[PDB]
Amino acid sequence: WTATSGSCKGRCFELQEVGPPDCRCDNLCKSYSSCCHDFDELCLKTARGWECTKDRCGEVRNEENACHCSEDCLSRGDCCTNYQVVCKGESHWVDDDCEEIKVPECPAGFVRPPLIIFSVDGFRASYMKKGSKVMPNIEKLRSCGTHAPYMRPVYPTKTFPNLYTLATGLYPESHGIVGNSMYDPVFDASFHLRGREKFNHRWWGGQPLWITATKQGVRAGTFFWSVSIPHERRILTILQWLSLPDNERPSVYAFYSEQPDFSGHKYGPFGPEMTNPLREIDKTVGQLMDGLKQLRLHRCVNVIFVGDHGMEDVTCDRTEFLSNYLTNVDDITLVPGTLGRIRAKSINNSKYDPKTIIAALTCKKPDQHFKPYMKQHLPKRLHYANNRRIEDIHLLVDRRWHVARKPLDVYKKCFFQGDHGFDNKVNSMQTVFVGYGPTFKYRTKVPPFENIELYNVMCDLLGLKPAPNNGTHGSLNHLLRTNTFRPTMPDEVSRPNYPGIMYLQSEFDLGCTCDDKVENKLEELNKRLHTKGSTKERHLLYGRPAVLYRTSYDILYHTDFESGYSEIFLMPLWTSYTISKQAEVSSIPEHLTNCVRPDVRVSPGFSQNCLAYKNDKQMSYGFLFPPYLSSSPEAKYDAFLVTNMVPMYPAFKRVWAYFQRVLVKKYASERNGVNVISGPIFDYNYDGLRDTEDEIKQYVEGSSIPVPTHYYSIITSCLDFTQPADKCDGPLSVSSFILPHRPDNDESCNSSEDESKWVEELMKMHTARVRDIEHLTGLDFYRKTSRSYSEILTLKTYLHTYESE
Ligand SMILES: *[C@@H]1O[C@H](CO)[C@@H](O[C@@H]2O[C@H](CO)[C@@H](O[C@@H]3O[C@H](CO[C@H]4O[C@H](CO)[C@@H](O)[C@H](O[C@H]5O[C@H](CO)[C@@H](O)[C@H](O)[C@@H]5O[C@H]5O[C@H](CO)[C@@H](O)[C@H](O)[C@@H]5O)[C@@H]4O)[C@@H](O)[C@H](O[C@H]4O[C@H](CO)[C@@H](O)[C@H](O)[C@@H]4O[C@H]4O[C@H](CO)[C@@H](O)[C@H](O)[C@@H]4O)[C@@H]3O)[C@H](O)[C@H]2NC(C)=O)[C@H](O)[C@H]1NC(C)=O
Ligand SMILES: O=C(CCN1CCN(C(=O)OCc2cc(Cl)cc(Cl)c2)CC1)c1ccc2[nH]c(=O)oc2c1
Ligand SMILES: [Ca+2]
Ligand SMILES: [Ca+2]
Ligand SMILES: [K+]
Ligand code: NA
Ligand SMILES: [Zn+2]
């Protein structure tokens, strides 16, 4: 119940939202149908439009007018944004030369530069170049401020997930807004774009920037705007708030534009109808900058121009229908469109089997434009599993396509030409970032970065301590003139043991054999030095990774590789090796085909055993350091140590062998040597974090050998590829992956073909950031470089996307 008989007199765009049944005057009241009776008359004035004219200059103040051209308007903070231009011979901000803003130039009584977040729905990254001729205000922010070529959204590339990620620094799986549509089985409640459930605070997890600000004594404007408040009025409201007294004035504000998303859905991302929405957004930016300039705030405020996601060409005719695959289609509920999520129509249906649904959806049509996944098998880079609101079955949809349950869903609802929601590495889904103001750098381009990082930077801009989030605080310090965040490297929790030769061959009863009994003081001291770490500076380029949890492990040195060997998991946490451009690939000799050798530095009790692999008819083994890349026939024996062995499904070995035998040497040739760190990952509860021993769901039959869920590799070289990886003076280049350790290649529809036709495509899909691997392993990499720690944090957040320009 709303007692709408209260009044908005003196309350228009109140920041403190008053509680029912008292009627509301805030920028959301319209959305809750709760505004006081006189809200439109008092708060949404339109009389005489939005622009001063020659005739209105020095006019008598008429309080019915939308904005003012009277002599008192600047003191009152309610001038039309073009007042000084029309009435005082001033220039529009866009016509002024760019001048470096070295220091905040703020009015007396400003404690900190305000932040204004100018958020634009569906603003695709390529609009900055393709629309530059029609967006002069935005082009001036972009060229004079700090900009990225693009900013990577979160998956799914939908509105609410991305806006709430911007506000919180969290993955959707953690903030809980995992789609524009959601069912929460614990609440038994549905979140929809239309209707009231979405306003319930139980959907919205983490701590958004406006709450972080308020809790630390920093006042915030209300970020959400009702669609019916015109953009001109949102801008005049922000400018009025900025004119409040020091004790009442917010330090942080958001503007939101429904464009260009709204038009992009109707006309496609580059439809000729898209020019006018881009012009209209640019005019709004011009109104804000002219308005700041009038208030002497244009060299005081930090402005962020940011999008939520891009926009792709999508039409009704590019729809896959589940009714073409499933006999049982009425037994499922599909969340449809540019992604799919499937659950049982009824939890009382005992016959519902997700295994049968996945199999019916797997590689059934030659050009099939979606791929089914159990959510724990999705690429780890999506971080899209650890939430009860994410259905177990997921459909990753090809760019330009939709999935729907039945044809009647598509033509009983063509109209639309654009959509978004696809995989967040897709070029069409990329969005924009520009930072302009005293705290941002001047005329600076920064590399592309992920929107999860912005919450930390917005906290840096406001002097706030950020709530715990998925950003890497410091990874964006290169955007900032000042207020940088200078973290310390995490403390190593476990120190390694450095075992020497402690066990005799005959103490091992592992069921292992090797034809290695083939026999010199020249090269007997040489092998001793290799085992004491004489080549370690060649194979461990960036220091040993730090172990950030309590465990028992050993450093093992060899001629060609170094490893941190876990006594708890009976395998390496990490294996490190350098392959020069000149390295040669060799075969596994016939005599060593099934060779596994005891490691005399490591107790039989802390070793794997071959008999477990022989007995396990599903499980085989591979090697973390590839025998194919041994430096010499004698060094190759080291690669067959039981301490280099890891459990591998035969289906996965096809992937691993091709990576090790073909791709490592290819990368070394292309990059002028590579350093590789490889290892296992255990994430049985799909939370993106290292499992403890007691979370492991699968062992090699009859053993305590745990089965990884994933295998990682981090492949580092010199950004200046004229310098070899092992002699690099400057910045580094990295590519990484987290390959799912699966007992089939059902993910790869072309897997019956030679590995050269499908393994690289699989590895590209499972590209990762070093930071993703850190979360999954509890390791901290790049501890010992020449480089600034902030530069290393940027490197650790890099994602190699394999997309074109
Ligand atoms: C991305 O960044 C985020 C933020 O840093 C990381 O998320 C954190 O991960 C931590 C580890 O998973 C997690 O810590 C847990 O917190 C529990 C208390 O949580 C509540 O309070 C916090 C603080 O106010 C709040 O943020 C939480 O919010 C979550 O839950 C609500 C639902 O009520 C959601 O609205 C909100 O969206 C958020 O959901 C997300 O997190 C939860 C898990 O907390 C997920 O289940 C959701 O799917 C969603 O992803 C909560 O309101 C605390 O109880 C936990 O403690 C257990 O574990 C410790 C281990 O140290 C153990 O020693 C304790 O005894 C305890 O065990 C007991 O409980 C077990 C579970 O019931 C039980 O099995 C045992 O038998 C024991 O009795 C734990 O400390 C932290 O909450 C989240 N924070 C957020 C915001 O998500 C995330 O990891 C990062 N991602 C990556 C890849 O790095
Ligand atoms: O329903 C909507 C939008 C609903 N609101 C979004 C939030 N918004 C707003 O003012 O957010 C401001 C804001 C909030 C936050 Cl958390 C963070 C910041 Cl940086 C800024 C008001 C409109 C919509 C829009 C586009 C869509 N495309 C599509 O397929 O479905 C769509 C639905
Ligand atoms: Ca959107
Ligand atoms: Ca885990
Ligand atoms: K086996
Ligand atoms: Na296959
Ligand atoms: Zn949209």
689 is in an annotated binding site: yes
Closest CA to 496 of 533, 562, 551: 551
Question: Tokens in use for 306?
Answer: 């940011």
683 is in an annotated binding site: yes
Q: Please state the atom number of ligand 2 nearest to the C-alpha of residue 224.
A: 10
- Do the beta carbons of residue 697 and residue 739 sit within 8 Å? no
Closest CA to 797 of 205, 123, 151, 146: 151
Q: Is 788 exposed, middle or buried (0-12, 13-18, 19+ CB in 10 A)?
A: middle
State whether the beta carbon of 117 lies less than 6 angstroms from ligand 2: yes
Q: How many CB atoms lie within 10 A of CB 776?
A: 24
CA distance 165 to 469: 10
- Do the beta carbons of residue 106 and residue 249 sit within 8 Å? no
State whether the beta carbon of 774 lies less than 6 angstroms from ligand 1: no
121 is in an annotated binding site: yes
CA of 606 to the centre of ligand 5 (A): 20
- What backbone torsions phi and psi does residue 146 show, to the nearest 5 degrees? -105, 130
Residue whose CB lies within 8 A of the most ligand 2 atoms, among 116, 166, 180, for a mutation test: 180
Task: Spot the catalytic one: 159, 237, 709, 767.
Answer: 159
Residues 6 or more apart in contact with residue 98 via CB below 8 angstroms: 140, 143, 144, 443
State whether the beta carbon of 256 lies less than 6 angstroms from ligand 2: yes
Protein residue closest via CA to atom 23 of ligand 1: 206
DSSP 92: P
CA of 681 to the centre of ligand 4 (A): 9
Method: X-ray
Bridge partners (DSSP) of residue 718 are 732
Q: Where are the alpha helices (DSSP H) in 44-200?
A: 73-76, 83-88, 127-130, 136-144, 159-168, 172-175
- The string over 369-401, giving b where at least 16 C-beta atoms fall within 10 Å of a residue's C-beta and e elsewhere, is bbbbbebbbbbbbbbbbbbebbbbbbbbbbbbb
State whether the beta carbon of 254 lies less than 6 angstroms from ligand 2: yes
Measured in angstroms, the resolution is 1.9
509 is in an annotated binding site: no
Question: Tokens in use for 610?
Answer: 């071959």
Parent domain of 566:
505-797
Find the Cα–Cα–Cα–Cα dihedral 686, 689, 690, 694, rounded to 10°: -60
Closest listed ligand to the CA of 619 = 5
Closest CA to 305 of 327, 288, 319, 321: 288
- Do the beta carbons of residue 744 and residue 651 sit within 8 Å? yes
Residue whose CB lies within 8 A of the most ligand 2 atoms, among 27, 120, 159, for a mutation test: 159
Tokens 């990886």 belong to which residue? 725
How many Cα atoms occupy the beta-carbon half-sphere of 331 within 13 Å?
13
The number of angstroms, rounded, from the C-alpha of 77 to the middle of its chain's C-alpha atoms is: 40
- Do the beta carbons of residue 633 and residue 588 sit within 8 Å? no
Closest listed ligand to the CA of 306 = 2
CA distance 489 to 468: 17
SS3 138: helix
CA of 342 to the centre of ligand 7 (A): 22
Strand 115-121 vs strand 302-307: parallel, antiparallel, or unpaired?
parallel
CA-CA distances (angstroms) from residue 142 to 195, 286, 310, 435, 747? Answer: 37, 13, 18, 8, 41
Q: Please state the atom number of ligand 2 nearest to the C-alpha of residue 308.
A: 19
How many Cα atoms occupy the beta-carbon half-sphere of 576 within 13 Å?
23
CA of 534 to the centre of ligand 4 (A): 36
Protein residue closest via CA to atom 16 of ligand 2: 164
The 3-class secondary structure across 699-729, one letter per residue, is ECCCCCCECCCEEEEEEEEECCCCCCHHHCC
State whether the beta carbon of 208 lies less than 6 angstroms from ligand 1: no
> For this structure, is 159 an active site residue?
yes
CA of 728 to the centre of ligand 6 (A): 40
97 is in an annotated binding site: no
Cis omega before residue 448 (within 30°)?
no
Question: Tokens in use for 763?
Answer: 């590895």
Closest CA to 23 of 42, 2, 38, 43: 2
Closest CA to 605 of 629, 575, 570: 570
- Do the beta carbons of residue 416 and residue 312 sit within 8 Å? no
Residue whose CB lies within 8 A of the most ligand 1 atoms, among 168, 171, 174, 459, for a mutation test: 174
SS3 395: strand
Angular region, 182: left φ>0, alpha ψ -120 to 50, beta rest: beta
CA distance 292 to 748: 55
- Do the beta carbons of residue 453 and residue 348 sit within 8 Å? no
State whether the beta carbon of 672 lies less than 6 angstroms from ligand 2: no
The number of angstroms, rounded, from the C-alpha of 190 to the middle of its chain's C-alpha atoms is: 26
Protein residue closest via CA to atom 1 of ligand 2: 193
Closest CA to 411 of 326, 315, 332: 315
CA distance 167 to 345: 34
Residues 6 or more apart in contact with residue 86 via CB below 8 angstroms: 51, 52, 53, 54, 56, 57, 69, 80
CA distance 501 to 638: 14
